[PDB]
Design a protein around this ligand. Structure first.
Ligand SMILES: CC(C)(C)c1ccc(N(C(=O)c2ccco2)[C@@H](C(=O)NCCc2cccc(F)c2)c2cccnc2)cc1
Ligand SMILES: CC(C)(C)c1ccc(N(C(=O)c2ccco2)[C@@H](C(=O)NCCc2cccc(F)c2)c2cccnc2)cc1
Ligand SMILES: [Cl-]
Lengths: 302, 305
């Protein structure tokens, strides 16, 4: 029993974190096999963060311009290439702690653990979700760039995020491990704004199912709704549209608790209309949206 | 920017988790040097659960009755002893991944990271606090016993909790690594209840300072209060008393934000008496109490391990 925001154990990722320095800039790198992945903005000059030409800046660098430190050992850079917004530094030593891994690009609503790092050293682990507006509400300070997001379903680490920057509103933007940004963001100092953020409806429903599994039924009602009437109400509270895919995904939780997805949608509609009236659901006075249907099943059933 | 519930990196602890089996029971063990620590209730059967005599149950066990598995390797148990509610299994191999460590007993209000494990395999990490009623609002399923709570202070892992059981309300009870329970709990199937819980006042103040550091100021006001008047209000709302020690500990955050601790207490008093009025603080409509002043400074300054 109990329901917590739970991150994956970070050990497999901790053994991959290294510090990457290029000139006056220091950030984190991810060392997997003989490659160190890091944000390409590590080569960006202070004099021009507005319109860097990364191809032009990189062609001027030699391998000895990249200082990679793994613990107290300096790794030797023997090659470098750029893939989208990620720099890949070939090193002369394969990481002996490289776990079984894969690179996965995630969709909005998906959750992942973040190992926040500074100077190649892990400082903390937290759980978060890719917002519908493609930002993440992380906790990151200066020098956190290169810190990664990941999932560890079984013994394989699926790396899904690499932190690149903080937007003016305090939210964060990054790329997958192929260097493709999530969202309409670019790695340069230009006016960039996160689009209006919305609530991840399918995740709120998953978390309401988690509450029912943990004995909380106060918010249930004798009503049901059509999917279209639910979405008409949902949009008015800045909730993401609930698709038939989302309804299908909630099927197992619906079958486990005996509450149909549209029956739970009617509870969500009532919660949006009334608020919680001094009550809580799983220790929260807000509707939580950073637990996916998969997270709920994993945490409740094992 | 941003403020999250953040756990310590768990890698140093993951390298210590093992599976301990005694008969039909399987749970987790903590392998440090040549000793595997686990809940002594691993030696209980169904009938034993109601009123177990652990000394009597243990004297009947031989070393080979304990099957310890570290990854895919079986460790050889060469001795066993009981300390309070923890069983210590001497093994023939020192854990080569044993980090620098210490066993510490924490006080209510103090936070720690929990590495939830099943069958000796880490499944998740979360941050929680030792409640004033000595329970933890954890997230644990069957077989999670032996999962541990810890902090990292510089390069040293301080183990402070070992999971033992779940109470009827869904909250959890365990011991320090010396086998002493936190709270008035016993390791047997008997009617046990978590006492009425209270809010960790110093932690709520720390989290209000974290909100100010992150740009949330709506709850600030021009007022201040005395420590005695604040404690009279705090007692009315089931908040723990705020001591002069708590005020001193919040000193650095007070100096950083320009909000004296009693000035922040006046914000907390108004929030208790009036609510949040539709507003949130750091993405929460409740006053969060599972961040200590040290957690706030550590996260708002990026301390690494
Ligand atoms: C791509 C450029 C512009 C060169 C970049 C510059 C700095 C960083 N940050 C760094 O800390 C950093 C460490 C090493 C190098 O940079 C910041 C940071 O993002 N700042 C603000 C950038 C900025 C401006 C204007 C519109 C923007 F969208 C972003 C940061 C703070 C908190 C958490 N995470 C990241 C990242 C990227
Ligand atoms: C001490 C005894 C009674 C032998 C004990 C028995 C079982 C367990 N549990 C186990 O999962 C477990 C794994 C291996 C052996 O047991 C439960 C569990 O606690 N159940 C309820 C027992 C119970 C009764 C009466 C007052 C209680 F406080 C507890 C559990 C579930 C979720 C999370 N954590 C723990 C722990 C302790
Ligand atoms: Cl996805």
């Amino acid at each position: 029993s109990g329901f917590r925001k739970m991150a994956f154990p970070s050990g497999k990722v901790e053994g991959c974190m290294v510090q990457v320095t290029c000139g006056t800039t220091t950030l984190n790198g991810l060392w997997l096999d003989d490659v160190v992945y890091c944000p390409r903005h590590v080569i960006c000059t202070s004099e021009d963060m507005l319109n860097p030409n990364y191809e032009d800046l990189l062609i001027r660098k030699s391998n000895h311009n990249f200082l990679v430190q793994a613990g107290n050992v300096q790794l030797r850079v023997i090659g470098h290439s750029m893939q989208n917004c990620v720099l890949k530094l070939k090193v002369d030593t394969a990481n002996p702690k490289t776990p079984k891994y894969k690179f996965v690009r995630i969709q909005p609503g998906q959750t992942f653990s973040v190992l926040a790092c500074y100077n190649g050293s892990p400082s903390g682990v937290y759980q978060c979700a890719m917002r519908p507006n493609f930002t993440i509400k992380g906790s990151f300070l200066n020098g956190s760039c290169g810190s990664v997001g990941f999932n560890i379903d079984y013994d394989c680490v699926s790396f899904c995020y690499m932190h690149h920057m903080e937007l003016p509103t305090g939210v964060h933007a990054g790329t997958d491990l192929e260097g493709n940004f999530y969202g309409p963001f670019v790695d340069r100092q230009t006016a960039q704004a996160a689009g209006t953020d919305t609530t991840i409806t399918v995740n709120v429903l998953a978390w309401l199912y988690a509450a029912v599994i943990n004995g909380d039924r106060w918010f249930l009602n004798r009503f049901t709704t059509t999917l279209n009437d639910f979405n008409l109400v949902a949009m008015k509270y800045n909730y993401e549209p609930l698709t038939q895919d989302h309804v299908d995904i909630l099927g197992p939780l619906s079958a486990q608790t005996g509450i149909a997805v549209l029956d739970m949608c009617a509870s969500l509609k009532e919660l949006l209309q009334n608020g919680m009236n001094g009550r809580t659901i799983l220790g929260s006075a807000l509707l939580e949206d950073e637990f996916t249907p998969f997270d709920v099943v994993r945490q409740c059933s094992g």
